[PDB]
Design a protein around this ligand. Structure first.
Ligand SMILES: C/N=C(\NC)NCCC[C@H](N)C(=O)O
Length: 64
């Protein structure tokens, strides 16, 4: 994980998010960010769902 940059993300960046449904970590890609709410919508890669997560709650992209 990239701890130092774990609050700032940009649209089009890959990440990991906590799926609200399993509570588990899954790979997701940032589709859009609302910097005012400090949240962003991410699309779960491989699944095709999109969920709104906090920028500071996002997790580093999977590479393994
Ligand atoms: C981010 N993860 C997912 N979707 C966006 N997973 C969908 C399949 C897993 C789900 N627990 C099931 O078995 O239905």
């Amino acid at each position: 994980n990239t701890a130092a940059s774990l609050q700032q993300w940009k649209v089009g960046d890959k990440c990991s998010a906590i799926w609200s449904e399993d509570g588990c970590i899954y790979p997701a890609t940032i589709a859009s960010i609302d910097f005012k709410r400090e949240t962003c919508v991410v699309v779960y890669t491989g699944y095709g769902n999109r969920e709104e997560q906090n920028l500071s709650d996002l997790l580093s992209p999977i590479c393994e």
